[PDB]
Every structure is written in structure tokens, then in C-alpha cells.
Amino acid sequence: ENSVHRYKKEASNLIKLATPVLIASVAQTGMGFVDTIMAGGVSAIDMAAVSIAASIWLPSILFGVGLLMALVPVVAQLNGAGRQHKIPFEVHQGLILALLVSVPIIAVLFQTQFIIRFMDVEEAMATKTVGYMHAVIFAVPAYLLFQALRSFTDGMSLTKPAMVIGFIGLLLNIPLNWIFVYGKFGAPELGGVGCGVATAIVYWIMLLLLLFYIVTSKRLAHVKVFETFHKPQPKELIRLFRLGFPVAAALFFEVTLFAVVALLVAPLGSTVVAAHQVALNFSSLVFMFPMSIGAAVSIRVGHKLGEQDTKGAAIAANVGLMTGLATACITALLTVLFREQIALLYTENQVVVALAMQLLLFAAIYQCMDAVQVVAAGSLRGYKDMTAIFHRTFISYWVLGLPTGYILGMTNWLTEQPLGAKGFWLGFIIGLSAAALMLGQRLYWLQKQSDDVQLHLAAK
Ligand SMILES: [Rb+]
């Protein structure tokens, strides 16, 4: 029984979600730069590049409040095989809040879009172009919710819709852009106006997968149909909040903090690229990896949580964990080689490859400890309120990390080190391996007794 049944089902479960979830990222990122940079990038005169950049930036924060409307969707809990129903209303409910948020964000949207801060050039251009192409990315989150139930939750959990709008999504974007970003066959557009239009068509397709793969459930029924408002479930939404609030600010409010530091500590040279290029890019993607595992094990841990209420921990926990280290490990320890050519990455010259190669190094290891931090956290703890204190945990490694890490760049500015820039980039890792330690002492919390339905007695 020891490890036998563990790695067995552990392995399985993870992958069924693994491959799914992974490909999905290829959507986000894949589609992301694809139709985005491709056209509105080397076309609106690179004024497509930097312009559309700040564009979806603002959105970045937004999509943030969006994950709040996603841990709700981990609520794929009430199907521990138990209430394989009651979820339909639980869901419909979420979806509502979906809109009840996108709008609270449209505000921020329209207005600042008209305000920017300066008048560079992205103004007019990106500004309102993607501007109403953003009204588009409000109807997107609605779909996002669908994904909640299906996509990830997938009724019980059959994360397949990934590759659905996945391979299908990115595909579409491409030509939709072509003809629109300029193409012309009813109207020829511009870069920002482009990536943007491509976007309208996105939540379009998304809806497609929405209704479709969901109310069609080629395999199941036990679905939706009649729904309604709510004030107390919307108080449970205040729980969808007091669960989603701990994630929204976390990952994204933090997203701003992330931004903060680096920049602040980005005047440390032309390295900007080194740092920027290296770290950011490559990493971001390897990060994309362990995060994949998370929501898998996060949901996977959340379904096995609800059956006989067995040992999903050692499983989902000790499993998911054990493996991301591989991926982190494997990706990290494979990363090592790829420096030089990876370095290339952003098509240029020697431009940092050396220190880049060095900075490159920093990432491999981050990916490592980062991985560990992700998983446990957002996943196991991602189950519920842990999300509340996984959040606390979040900033614990933050303030400690960064200031410690910048003051590491700055320790050069203090004690002493071979390169304050690279090195400060590093202090950041300290943060992630630091917080990564933090959720470990969240070691289930005394593990689970019957304080499990207690988490769902404050979550139910
Ligand atoms: Rb990061």
C-alpha cells in the first residue's frame, strides 16, 4: 500500500489534468504573443509592440480579480461524488458575480483609457482601440466562468476544454486578425485595433465552447437551466469573495508589487534587458509549467477531498509536490544548457548572454523553489480558506524577499557580492523558497481530522 497506490492514482490524476491544463497555457501565452505581436507588432510600426503592451497590462490586473471568480470554480468541490448536483445553482451563481465584477472593472477601463498618463503614441491607437475591444474582454470573463465549471472543474473534473478553445482558439485568432488587423474584407484595421478585434472574436469562440461542451456534455447531463439572483449565496459570494479575495489581490495585486521592485531596481543598468529578457521571458513560461500542476492538484485535491474525504493530502499533496519538483527540477536542470540560444530568445546580439547566461541560471533555480511554492499553496491550500492564509503567506515571502533581495542588489550596495543586479534579481528567489517554506508549515495544518468539513462549514 505504501507509495504503491500513491504514485499510482497520484500519477494518473495529475496527468489527466496535466496535459490538459498545460496546453491551455499554450493558449493564453501561445495565442497571446502570436496574433498579438505577429501582426500588431511588426506592423503598426513596433508602435504596435510597445503600445498594445501597456494595453492588456491594465487588463492583467483585471484578469486578476478574475481568478477570484476562479477559486470559486475550485468549488468543483460539491461533487466529491457527493452533491453531484446543487452545483448547477452554485455555478450559475458564480457566473453572475462574473459580470458583477467585469463591470466594476469596465469603469477603471473606459476612464483611464481616456486618461493614460501621457500622450506617447499608444494613445489614440491602443487606448480606445483595444479600448472597446476590451468591452469585449468583459464578456470574456463570463465565459471564463463556464471554464470554471467545465474547463477546470469540468462538472466533476475532466479538464478537456483546454485544447477546445485551446488549439482552436489560437488558430482562429490568427486569421481573424489577418483580415482585421488589416486584411480587409468588410474593413481593414490597425495593430491595437487588431489584436483587439481578434479579441472580440475570442469571447465569441469562448461562448461557443461555453454553451457547447457544457450544456451538451456529450458525456453527461446533470446540468444547468433555471437560475436566479441571490443575496446570501452572494454572501456566500462574499465567501466566493472570502476565498477569492485572498487569491485576487494575492497573485495580481502582488503582480503589481512584482512589477514594482524590478523596475524600481531596473535603473541598475542596460542589463534591464539581461534582467528583463532573460528572467522574465523564459522563466514566465517555465513558471507557466508548475502552475499547471497546481490547479490540477488544486482541483484534484479538491475532488478527492469530497468523496470518502480520504487522504487526498499525502496523495494530491505529496503527489503534486513530488512531481513539480521533477518539472521544476527537470526544467530547471535542462534550462542550464539552453542559456546561450535561449539567451538569443529576444532576437538581438551578445546583449547580456554572458550575465544573461548568469541570470539565466537564477531562473532555473527559481523555477525550482517557485514550483514548490505554487503547488502546495494555490492548490492544496488552494482548496479554500487556506487561500485566505495562503495569501498572508504570500506577502510573508514578499516583503521579506524583495526588500531583502533588492537590498541584496543593495547588499552589494551593503555587504558585498559579485553582481548587485543579477544578485538582486536572485534575492527574489529567496522570497519564493522562503514563502515556499511558509505553506509547508501549513502542512495541512494538523493535517485533516474532521476539520475538513469544517473548512467546508465555513465554506459549505
Ligand atoms: Rb514572478
Side-chain angles (χ1 to χ4, degrees):
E1 276 192 354
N2 256 58
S3 74
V4 202
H5 297 185
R6 268 227 268 69
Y7 56 72
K8 214 170 178 288
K9 187 159 193 170
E10 289 184 300
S12 56
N13 298 193
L14 67 87
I15 171 189
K16 304 174 172 175
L17 305 193
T19 71
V21 313
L22 195 287
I23 284 298
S25 77
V26 158
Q28 209 253 308
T29 41
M31 63 180 235
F33 100 58
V34 171
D35 74 66
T36 292
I37 278 290
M38 148 244 268
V42 189
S43 280
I45 297 296
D46 293 7
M47 285 327 102
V50 300
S51 301
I52 65 81
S55 150
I56 306 183
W57 169 96
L58 301 66
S60 143
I61 93 134
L62 133 139
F63 217 65
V65 301
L67 190 293
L68 175 169
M69 268 285 312
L71 213 301
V72 168
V74 307
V75 75
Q77 53 188 289
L78 272 59
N79 175 276
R83 309 177 181 183
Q84 55 173 173
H85 161 59
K86 300 159 191 181
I87 70 173
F89 239 163
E90 175 73 305
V91 156
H92 306 12
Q93 230 325 305
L95 196 165
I96 300 178
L97 177 46
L99 297 60
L100 328 179
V101 168
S102 60
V103 177
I105 276 283
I106 312 175
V108 175
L109 196 291
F110 175 26
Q111 203 60 45
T112 193
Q113 300 302 58
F114 247 43
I115 201 184
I116 294 282
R117 171 295 318 292
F118 218 45
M119 186 214 94
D120 298 57
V121 287
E122 176 207 70
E123 24 70 318
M125 272 184 115
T127 296
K128 295 317 293 295
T129 52
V130 280
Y132 53 123
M133 293 299 101
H134 296 152
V136 163
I137 195 174
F138 281 119
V140 164
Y143 141 90
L144 133 286
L145 172 278
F146 147 75
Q147 133 218 174
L149 161 56
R150 179 47 183 297
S151 189
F152 289 55
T153 288
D154 306 79
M156 308 211 215
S157 58
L158 185 66
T159 181
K160 177 196 177 176
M163 297 59 147
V164 82
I165 179 271
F167 256 116
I168 284 305
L170 121 163
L171 181 277
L172 302 164
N173 274 192
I174 282 185
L176 283 305
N177 275 277
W178 169 56
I179 172 183
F180 281 80
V181 179
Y182 200 26
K184 192 287 178 57
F185 268 158
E189 325 300 346
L190 175 62
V193 210
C195 89
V197 157
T199 304
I201 296 164
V202 188
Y203 101 101
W204 173 69
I205 70 189
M206 305 179 137
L207 125 151
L208 192 281
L209 314 326
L210 151 52
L211 173 72
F212 213 83
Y213 256 34
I214 192 52
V215 194
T216 196
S217 179
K218 21 71 184 73
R219 29 208 75 176
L220 326 70
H222 11 316
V223 295
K224 35 158 291 181
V225 151
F226 259 76
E227 66 221 7
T228 65
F229 77 123
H230 255 300
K231 169 58 168 4
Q233 203 164 308
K235 193 165 182 172
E236 171 171 338
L237 262 55
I238 299 176
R239 200 186 295 161
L240 270 75
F241 257 75
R242 201 109 216 301
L243 174 256
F245 189 90
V247 288
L251 219 285
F252 280 77
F253 181 65
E254 96 183 326
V255 100
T256 302
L257 294 171
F258 179 89
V260 177
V261 168
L263 166 55
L264 259 284
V265 202
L268 321 182
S270 62
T271 287
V272 49
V273 159
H276 188 67
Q277 255 68 310
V278 179
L280 194 164
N281 291 188
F282 184 66
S283 309
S284 160
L285 273 46
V286 193
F287 159 96
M288 193 167 65
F289 256 55
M291 195 237 74
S292 296
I293 296 182
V297 173
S298 190
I299 71 170
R300 183 293 192 75
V301 76
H303 170 59
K304 201 57 56 189
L305 206 66
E307 218 194 319
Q308 280 193 62
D309 313 274
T310 187
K311 302 290 95 278
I315 325 308
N318 288 64
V319 54
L321 299 169
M322 232 181 94
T323 44
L325 203 294
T327 63
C329 183
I330 164 73
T331 60
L333 266 60
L334 65 76
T335 290
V336 40
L337 157 57
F338 267 38
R339 42 196 177 175
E340 38 47 282
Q341 200 168 329
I342 278 295
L344 241 216
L345 215 175
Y346 204 48
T347 294
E348 307 155 309
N349 70 289
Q350 161 295 319
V351 69
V352 194
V353 172
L355 275 64
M357 168 284 268
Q358 285 221 68
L359 302 210
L360 285 165
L361 158 154
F362 119 129
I365 307 197
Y366 167 113
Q367 292 163 40
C368 168
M369 287 317 133
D370 149 47
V372 67
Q373 186 254 45
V374 183
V375 54
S379 171
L380 318 196
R381 285 33 179 178
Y383 68 47
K384 221 316 120 178
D385 62 53
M386 319 69 221
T387 57
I389 293 203
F390 94 165
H391 179 65
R392 167 159 311 317
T393 303
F394 232 155
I395 245 163
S396 87
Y397 90 131
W398 179 60
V399 98
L400 189 65
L402 288 177
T404 236
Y406 179 7
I407 289 198
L408 185 288
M410 310 163 118
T411 269
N412 178 318
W413 298 195
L414 227 312
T415 310
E416 202 24 47
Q417 64 160 304
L419 189 304
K422 70 171 190 176
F424 127 86
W425 243 190
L426 149 161
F428 191 86
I429 215 185
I430 285 312
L432 280 78
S433 165
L437 195 78
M438 301 298 85
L439 301 301
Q441 281 194 181
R442 213 283 187 289
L443 176 268
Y444 323 125
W445 171 278
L446 59 57
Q447 293 160 297
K448 74 254 281 87
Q449 312 308 297
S450 85
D451 290 353
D452 57 307
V453 74
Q454 192 283 176
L455 301 172
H456 296 157
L457 236 65
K460 198 178 304 177

